[PDB]
Design a protein around this ligand. Structure first.
Ligand SMILES: *[C@@H]1O[C@H](CO)[C@@H](O[C@@H]2O[C@H](CO)[C@@H](O[C@@H]3O[C@H](CO[C@H]4O[C@H](CO)[C@@H](O)[C@H](O)[C@@H]4O)[C@@H](O)[C@H](O[C@H]4O[C@H](CO)[C@@H](O)[C@H](O)[C@@H]4O)[C@@H]3O)[C@H](O)[C@H]2NC(C)=O)[C@H](O)[C@H]1NC(C)=O
Ligand SMILES: *[C@@H]1O[C@H](CO)[C@@H](O[C@@H]2O[C@H](CO)[C@@H](O[C@@H]3O[C@H](CO[C@H]4O[C@H](CO)[C@@H](O)[C@H](O)[C@@H]4O)[C@@H](O)[C@H](O)[C@@H]3O)[C@H](O)[C@H]2NC(C)=O)[C@H](O)[C@H]1NC(C)=O
Ligand SMILES: *[C@@H]1O[C@H](CO)[C@@H](O[C@@H]2O[C@H](CO)[C@@H](O[C@@H]3O[C@H](CO)[C@@H](O)[C@H](O)[C@@H]3O)[C@H](O)[C@H]2NC(C)=O)[C@H](O)[C@H]1NC(C)=O
Ligand SMILES: *[C@@H]1O[C@H](CO)[C@@H](O[C@@H]2O[C@H](CO)[C@@H](O[C@@H]3O[C@H](CO)[C@@H](O)[C@H](O)[C@@H]3O)[C@H](O)[C@H]2NC(C)=O)[C@H](O)[C@H]1NC(C)=O
Ligand SMILES: *[C@@H]1O[C@H](CO)[C@@H](O[C@@H]2O[C@H](CO)[C@@H](O)[C@H](O)[C@H]2NC(C)=O)[C@H](O)[C@H]1NC(C)=O
Ligand SMILES: *[C@@H]1O[C@H](CO)[C@@H](O[C@@H]2O[C@H](CO)[C@@H](O)[C@H](O)[C@H]2NC(C)=O)[C@H](O)[C@H]1NC(C)=O
Ligand SMILES: *[C@@H]1O[C@H](CO)[C@@H](O[C@@H]2O[C@H](CO)[C@@H](O)[C@H](O)[C@H]2NC(C)=O)[C@H](O)[C@H]1NC(C)=O
Ligand SMILES: *[C@@H]1O[C@H](CO)[C@@H](O[C@@H]2O[C@H](CO)[C@@H](O)[C@H](O)[C@H]2NC(C)=O)[C@H](O)[C@H]1NC(C)=O
Ligand SMILES: *[C@@H]1O[C@H](CO)[C@@H](O[C@@H]2O[C@H](CO)[C@@H](O)[C@H](O)[C@H]2NC(C)=O)[C@H](O)[C@H]1NC(C)=O
Ligand SMILES: *[C@@H]1O[C@H](CO)[C@@H](O)[C@H](O)[C@H]1NC(C)=O
Ligand SMILES: *[C@@H]1O[C@H](CO)[C@@H](O)[C@H](O)[C@H]1NC(C)=O
Ligand SMILES: *[C@@H]1O[C@H](CO)[C@@H](O)[C@H](O)[C@H]1NC(C)=O
Ligand SMILES: *[C@@H]1O[C@H](CO)[C@@H](O)[C@H](O)[C@H]1NC(C)=O
Ligand SMILES: *[C@@H]1O[C@H](CO)[C@@H](O)[C@H](O)[C@H]1NC(C)=O
Ligand SMILES: *[C@@H]1O[C@H](CO)[C@@H](O)[C@H](O)[C@H]1NC(C)=O
Ligand SMILES: *[C@@H]1O[C@H](CO)[C@@H](O)[C@H](O)[C@H]1NC(C)=O
Ligand SMILES: *[C@@H]1O[C@H](CO)[C@@H](O)[C@H](O)[C@H]1NC(C)=O
Ligand SMILES: *[C@@H]1O[C@H](CO)[C@@H](O)[C@H](O)[C@H]1NC(C)=O
Ligand SMILES: *[C@@H]1O[C@H](CO)[C@@H](O)[C@H](O)[C@H]1NC(C)=O
Ligand SMILES: *[C@@H]1O[C@H](CO)[C@@H](O)[C@H](O)[C@H]1NC(C)=O
Ligand SMILES: *[C@@H]1O[C@H](CO)[C@@H](O)[C@H](O)[C@H]1NC(C)=O
Ligand SMILES: *[C@@H]1O[C@H](CO)[C@@H](O)[C@H](O)[C@H]1NC(C)=O
Ligand SMILES: *[C@@H]1O[C@H](CO)[C@@H](O)[C@H](O)[C@H]1NC(C)=O
Ligand SMILES: *[C@@H]1O[C@H](CO)[C@@H](O)[C@H](O)[C@H]1NC(C)=O
Ligand SMILES: *[C@@H]1O[C@H](CO)[C@@H](O)[C@H](O)[C@H]1NC(C)=O
Lengths: 106, 115, 441, 135, 135, 135, 35, 48, 115, 115
């Protein structure tokens, strides 16, 4: 039972600011951490795999980093199409466990 | 791959919930993981269980013995059965396929558990 | 201490060998004939990193496989039809004056003949309308009467191109390239494997490629050694150019039987007005697409050169003009309005006149036929222009101010833009490796 | 390591992996040498039969040749044929864990025949040696 | 053991037999997998050729997985893979003599793909373990 | 014994030699049992396919009959079953050094059905004894 | 219509090759190898 | 010698109207009926 | 299988007795054991001998060399010959099918040995 | 079998001599010995080296390391390369086939080593 505590649930932001999201793991296990993006009325979509690498089609403005118990996702130059929910997840050992979730507001 | 969920949208409490995931574009007897995932009101996700390519099973312990997951390889379909349902189990149910840094989700279906 | 030889069975080893392929299709027609095995719709696309394979189109035998295969599929679908041998009786053709403009003068002929009823002792008087390209003087006779008879091609079937999947049996694999800036030949750093490919449309044309596949990023020019002026420059678009082709004549069908159980659908009288079949394309979209081509064309040549466009170099109508088969009726289009432009460094429709020819010599084989029966009702056709075939003209002085002309004719190049990324390899599971061993005696 | 991190290795997935890492990938390659047309007139009738027999007798060609060397029923076997210094002047550390199988066959493609002939002669050498000690 | 008790099993004669009695009968059910067409135009140029090559491909499919598991050429192969008790909660005395093999295959029809794939995963490990101890 | 005097016997060359001279050439004879048509219309459309599948089925029938006896993968395999001397009352000195396999077949062609059937009953008995002893 | 054959508006007939007969000699169906 | 091997102590579910034995042989002798009509000569001039 | 005995119903003493058993519905050359059994007055049964598919013969030793048993494989028939008959050999002669825990008998025929 | 030698008829001193033997009528991957033999002015023969069907190489020691012999099995051709040539190596070069008391020779070609 790795417990993932996220910083905040609702955060207000403006277009053009750098924003950084953080996730804290109960144990220091691995660097194999993934972020998923979920827009309203849509299923979640995988964004980052192995914490530092990008997926095909994902824009360059998305970066991620961290290790141990601390993992930081950074969005830079926020546009309108990035309104969504983001979740820090881990895929090391069963049972799979989800974060609570963070909602972006513009 | 395309995934399409089907089944009754209303289930009476204490009765059994059955859903069908119809899979097209890929064979369930070859590779990857074939999952059921649900989303509660308030946008929270809880993983229920998975399947191996060889038909092995595994479940989230929080669901105890309430879940059996089964498949029909002739029709290329797999199935969810959920015993002893409660209205706090009302949620939108997805069947998803995950692996090899490729994650695909169905469109989902809505179910309400009420009398 | 000294090393020893081993045997490994089931090792990935590739050698470039080519064999016959096998058809597959999704869920009666001329292309499939309900005979291909319905494939499972899972092209399992396994990515292979750290590998660079030297692809080479214009030498791939899969292009020559599909050209030969659909010839065998064409004559197979023509056997249960009816032979049109008795159509070489004499004709008495007069021009049509029923609501016709000056542009269609001398194009439709009202003929009459003495073709036979199913009873041998009884004849009949049958009138029909043939195009000017279908009849020749002797009053008139059909063009094919000094060639073999015709077939009429069984109009219960259709000519819509059903996608066809080619994929080899066990022991062979198909590798595909995935480079966004992929040229024709040379190595590919994104080689992956697929057991059985995607849908390939067998649609045929001469000048402009229709209903093809789009490029990834920009308009890509796929050619071998460029100083040849007798070789076709293959250009694939990055955007779809919509083309609107219609036939505004309300045609009817007169079913008159030639013999016992043998029907022959002639053309009835035309109701309404006589008008020209034409193809419409957007002038603003085509000028934008030609702007993207000449930037990529000047990458392979000088920057200060003058690239000039022109029409075809003349010849017979089979090879000079355009051809497509939407609606079941053949269209031969004058494409001199889409290539009248010159280019130096630094309104909603283009009306292309189009002729309609019923009797067709389809491929380069001369001893056959294609008697397309008339289609009842008007014809609506919407398609995308996705490719060009350009032949560079010779006579260039000091390697400057060259011109580009269309062409084609050979059906090899119509599918070279759809099988450019594919090759087939032969797998040997045997191999050897050094490590330390002594057999347990 | 599980979930999206699980590796199922596909088919022909060890083409770019090293020779040491491909020593556990031998099973998935051999299972695709026979199947594929398991579910079903001149056109496309003889074209399957010509391809079906060709896919079988080439497998029997590589399986009979395994049985002549004494390697029948095994995937990774190794004989007593001494491969010598002229064929490859590299140690085992310079072959296994730093390069892959695909271009390894190109240097040995000249020496494939000399390797194959010595293995079938060496097996028949130790068949008569088994006869002497058994009697 | 004679007269009415003599053995005239033939082909498939131990179909309804107990598993202990049918364990002696695996020899006679192997030879009738390729023969029958030992002695000899659109019709039957395909109807005979398609079924003859199908019997070859089904026979080599059964032999090849018997070779991947590492014990090809053996009629009774018993390997070193532990089995899960969830597939069948019956002991040795409740399997081999009280029930017919036909209904037993339906009981393990669902769990066939688990046990068919675990055999070769413990055979490549077996061949890797054989290589370490040999050198 | 070099140059023009070297041994290049090839296929079917040892068909006139003695028993012990022909026993060393079993590799080259079985090499030509599958290949030969490795390089490639109604006529010879059915004749070509019937040519190969007839040849494949005979080779598989020989290997499967060898695999029943437990000699699969071996070229010179020998069992431990007795044989009655009434078939041939000749010692090893008068048979294994002075006569050809061609005239040997006609003297035992009466008893090939008997001597083949005594081999699957022999081979299955060690497997029965292996199951009792090792359990 | 004077008269004509009934199948003259359909495809023509063949006279069934009167050298051979229509008497059914019994046939036996067999399963292939493995069936 | 049509070798028939009796199997006792066994049952099976027979299902008529759905086997391919009926469906194939109906297709089989139709192909045997059209094949024997090809060497027969046509009667095209009989429609006088 | 059906078995039917045939032959003369009256045989003179010291002469030879010949009977035919005609078999239909099964081939005697790929097969079971085929026996002759007779029933005496007073309902006693004595087994005389058998045949095998491979042509091997077996007889009760008590009958010495008095009996040769033979067959015709073209007609699917086998035959009894009994030399040197006596009136105590009068009996109802059956040809029998036995094997695989199955036993089938013919209807039998009557024979009287008298002058 | 037919053998045909080909290559340049004039080679500059100290440069390399290359000749091709094109073989037809027999496969170089099956058997016997494949040799190069040359004849000097004055009718003297000297054996330079051979090949085997399995790719093994052997050379006359008198020629030291001056000779590499190589082949292309796709084209069914084998090749001679001779380094560091001298005018005393001028001769008519034959490719010949030997074994099983058979001996077939090509027609030969003439080469002159001069500047
Ligand atoms: C067709 O049949 C003929 C005759 O039957 C075979 O010819 C020879 O047959 C003999 C009889 O068995 C073989 O036996 C050899 O006898 C040698 C001594 O006998 C004389 O041999 C020759 C005359 O043949 C004289 O020159 C010699 O001086 C002797 O007086 C033994 O020495 C042989 O044993 C071993 O000898 C050397 C030792 O290294 C080996 O090279 C041999 O292979 C052998 O191991 C042997 O016992 C004799 O082998 C046959 N000759 C040949 C050339 O094989 C034909 O061979 C046969 N045709 C075929 C195709 O087999
Ligand atoms: C390139 O691809 C295009 C997209 O498929 C092709 O356009 C299609 O061409 C076919 C001719 O083969 C047209 O089919 C005709 O349709 C009309 C009317 O269509 C109505 O009926 C169909 C069938 O029920 C239905 O699907 C439609 O929605 C309409 O309700 C029929 O009267 C004809 O008989 C014929 O079937 C397609 O309509 C047409 N698609 C569109 C969107 O217009 C194009 O032909 C291809 N290019 C080439 C050169 O082949
Ligand atoms: C000629 O080119 C046009 C491009 O405008 C092709 O239009 C294509 O139309 C289909 C069906 O409407 C589109 O598929 C759908 O796209 C939406 C986009 O969000 C997607 O959400 C759906 O799930 C569905 O896939 C397709 O995208 C569109 N093509 C492009 C490039 O946008 C037209 O089909 C072409 N004609 C031929 C004959 O190829
Ligand atoms: C169908 O079921 C019946 C059972 O009701 C089978 O009868 C069984 O026949 C076998 C014949 O081999 C008997 O085995 C024998 O057992 C004795 C010991 O009693 C042993 O000494 C022999 O060597 C032999 O193994 C078996 O006992 C008998 N079953 C019972 C309960 O007595 C019948 O054969 C079955 N039909 C088949 C298999 O086709
Ligand atoms: C193709 O383009 C031509 C040219 O615009 C169109 O012809 C026009 O047709 C309308 C009838 O609705 C007339 O009112 C216009 O005057 C015509 N234009 C000209 C320049 O004369 C034609 O309709 C187009 N066809 C299609 C199918 O779009
Ligand atoms: C081709 O013809 C169509 C008429 O069918 C023109 O109109 C388009 O029609 C489609 C569907 O009917 C619409 O989705 C488009 O929005 C229409 N276009 C416009 C501009 O309104 C179409 O414009 C013609 N295209 C060309 C290049 O001539
Ligand atoms: C390409 O376009 C040119 C026009 O520049 C055509 O040349 C004309 O051809 C006609 C033939 O009917 C002559 O009457 C004209 O005199 C020609 N024009 C000039 C300026 O000489 C040429 O025929 C076209 N080619 C094709 C294949 O369509
Ligand atoms: C294709 O169309 C063009 C114009 O639509 C034709 O070119 C015309 O040819 C005639 C022939 O003498 C000239 O009088 C005209 O001046 C030309 N038009 C222009 C704009 O210059 C061309 O001939 C047509 N192609 C064919 C093969 O007929
Ligand atoms: C493709 O090549 C890269 C080389 O960079 C491989 O990356 C190595 O992977 C191994 C384990 O998989 C690590 O231990 C090394 O540290 C990696 N980096 C190196 C050698 O620089 C990669 O694994 C290869 N791909 C495959 C499928 O094997
Ligand atoms: C019919 O059209 C042809 C076309 O050239 C013309 O030569 C002829 O004079 C026309 N006849 C009439 C009667 O209009
Ligand atoms: C058909 O034949 C009749 C009789 O010979 C003749 O009068 C008539 O002109 C013919 N029709 C044509 C179109 O020549
Ligand atoms: C048929 O006649 C026309 C009329 O001139 C001619 O152009 C054509 O070449 C001829 N066809 C053949 C095959 O000779
Ligand atoms: C890609 O184009 C051709 C292949 O036709 C090749 O010769 C060339 O070197 C490649 N690169 C560029 C930049 O053209
Ligand atoms: C064709 O390619 C060759 C390369 O072999 C090149 O030298 C030549 O210039 C190219 N063009 C022509 C016209 O030969
Ligand atoms: C064409 O016009 C005729 C006139 O009678 C009409 O019957 C037919 O429906 C029309 N066809 C179309 C496609 O409008
Ligand atoms: C053709 O001529 C016939 C002669 O009767 C006439 O009925 C028909 O209307 C004419 N058709 C045309 C299109 O001129
Ligand atoms: C088409 O593009 C060229 C590019 O130089 C331009 O000169 C011309 O005016 C454009 N025509 C139209 C109609 O936009
Ligand atoms: C043409 O211009 C481009 C800039 O767009 C430049 O990269 C290229 O080198 C130029 N070509 C020549 C031959 O100078
Ligand atoms: C190209 O179009 C212009 C438009 O005015 C026209 O004047 C010119 O003659 C055309 N050229 C050709 C070759 O058709
Ligand atoms: C090649 O190997 C053989 C034995 O297989 C050995 O005798 C020979 O010396 C080796 N070659 C060299 C150059 O050492
Ligand atoms: C095996 O599967 C079938 C259908 O998939 C099912 O009806 C049966 O209950 C299953 N058996 C077990 C023991 O789970
Ligand atoms: C002797 O040979 C006979 C063949 O008729 C055979 O049945 C018997 O078992 C043999 N005896 C021995 C002891 O091998
Ligand atoms: C075996 O049978 C054959 C043919 O019946 C016969 O020629 C041969 O002599 C027999 N064998 C013996 C040893 O008698
Ligand atoms: C042919 O004529 C007969 C006679 O009435 C009729 O029954 C039949 O329907 C006709 N068939 C066709 C295809 O016209
Ligand atoms: C292998 O053979 C080819 C052609 O015979 C030759 O070019 C290449 O150099 C050879 N490789 C080695 C390592 O000798």
């Amino acid at each position: 039972d790795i417990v993932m505590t996220q910083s905040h649930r609702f955060m207000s932001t403006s277009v053009g600011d750098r924003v950084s999201i953080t996730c804290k793991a109960s144990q220091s296990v691995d660097t194999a951490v993934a972020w998923y993006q979920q827009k309203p009325g849509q299923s979640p979509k995988l964004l980052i795999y192995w914490a530092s690498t990008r997926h095909p089609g994902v824009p360059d403005r998305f970066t991620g980093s961290g290790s141990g118990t601390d993992f930081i996702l950074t969005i830079s130059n926020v546009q309108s199409e990035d309104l969504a929910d983001y979740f820090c997840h881990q895929f090391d050992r069963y049972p799979l466990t989800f974060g609570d979730g963070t909602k972006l507001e513009l | 791959v395309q995934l399409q969920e089907s089944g009754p949208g209303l289930v009476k409490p204490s009765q059994s919930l059955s859903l069908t995931c119809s899979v097209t574009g890929y064979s369930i007897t070859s590779a990857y993981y074939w999952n059921w995932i649900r989303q509660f009101p308030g946008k929270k996700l809880e993983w229920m269980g998975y399947l191996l390519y060889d038909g092995s099973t595994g479940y989230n312990p929080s669901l105890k013995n309430r879940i059996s997951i089964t498949r029909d390889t002739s029709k290329n379909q797999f199935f969810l059965k959920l015993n002893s349902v409660t209205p706090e189990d009302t949620a939108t149910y997805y069947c998803s396929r995950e692996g090899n840094n490729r994650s695909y989700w169905g469109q989902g279906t809505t179910l309400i558990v009420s009398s | 201490e000294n090393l020893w030889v081993t045997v490994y069975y089931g090792v990935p080893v590739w050698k470039d060998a080519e064999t016959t392929l096998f058809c597959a299709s999704d869920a009666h027609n001329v292309w499939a004939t309900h005979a291909c095995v319905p494939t499972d719709p899972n092209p399992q696309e396994i990515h292979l990193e750290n590998v660079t394979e030297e692809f080479n189109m214009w030498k791939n035998n899969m292009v020559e496989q599909m050209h030969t295969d659909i010839i065998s599929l064409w004559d197979q679908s023509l056997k249960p039809c009816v032979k049109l041998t008795p159509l070489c009786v004499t004709l008495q053709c007069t021009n049509v004056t029923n609501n016709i403009t000056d542009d269609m003068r001398g194009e439709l002929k009202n003929c009459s003949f003495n073709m036979t009823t199913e009873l041998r002792d009884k004849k009949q008087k049958v009138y029909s309308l043939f195009y000017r390209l279908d009849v020749v003087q002797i009053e008139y006779r059909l063009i094919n009467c000094n060639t073999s008879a015709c077939t009429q091609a069984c109009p219960k079937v259709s000519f819509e191109p059903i996608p066809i999947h080619y994929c080899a049996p066990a022991g062979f694999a198909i590798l595909k390239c995935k480079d966004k800036k992929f040229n024709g030949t040379g190595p590919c750093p994104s080689v992956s494997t697929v057991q059985c490919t995607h849908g390939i449309k067998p649609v045929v044309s001469t000048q402009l490629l229709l209903n093809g596949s789009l490029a990834e990023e920009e308009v890509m020019i796929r050619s071998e050694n460029i100083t040849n002026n007798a070789k076709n420059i293959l250009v694939q678009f990055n955007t779809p150019v919509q083309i609107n082709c219609t036939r505004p004549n309300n045609n009817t069908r007169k079913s008159i039987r030639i013999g016992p159980g043998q029907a022959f659908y002639a053309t009835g009288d035309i109701i309404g007005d006589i008008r020209q079949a034409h193809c419409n394309v957007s002038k603003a979209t085509w000028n934008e697409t030609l702007g993207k081509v000449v930037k990529q064309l000047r990458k392979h040549f000088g920057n200060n050169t003058i690239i000039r466009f022109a029409n075809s170099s003349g010849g017979d109508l089979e090879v000079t003009t355009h051809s497509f088969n939407c609606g079941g009726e053949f269209f031969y289009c004058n494409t001199s309005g889409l290539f009248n432009s010159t280019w130096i460094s630094n309104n909603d429709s283009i009306t292309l006149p189009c002729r309609i020819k019923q009797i067709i010599n389809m491929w380069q084989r001369i001893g056959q036929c294609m008697y397309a029966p008339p289609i009842q009702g008007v014809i609506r056709c919407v398609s995308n222009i996705t490719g060009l075939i350009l032949t560079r003209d010779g006579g260039s002085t000091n390697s400057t101010t060259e011109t580009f002309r269309p062409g084609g004719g050979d059906m090899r190049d119509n599918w070279r833009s759809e099988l450019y990324k594919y090759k087939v390899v032969k797998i040997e599971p045997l191999g050897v490796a050094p490590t330390r061993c002594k057999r347990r005696v | 390591a599980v979930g999206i991190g699980a590796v199922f290795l596909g088919f022909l997935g060890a083409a770019g992996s090293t020779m040491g890492a491909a020593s556990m990938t031998l099973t998935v390659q051999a299972r695709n040498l026979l199947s594929g047309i398991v579910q079903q007139l001149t056109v496309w009738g003889i074209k399957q039969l010509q391809a079906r027999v060709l896919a079988v007798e080439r497998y029997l060609r590589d399986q009979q040749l395994l049985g002549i060397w004494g390697c029948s029923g095994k995937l990774i076997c190794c004989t007593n044929v001494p491969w010598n210094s002229s064929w490859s002047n590299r140690n085992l550390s310079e072959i296994w864990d730093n390069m892959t199988w695909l271009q390894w066959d190109k240097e040995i493609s000249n020496y494939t025949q000399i390797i194959y002939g010595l293995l079938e002669e060496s097996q028949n050498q130790q068949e008569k040696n088994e006869q002497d000690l058994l009697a």
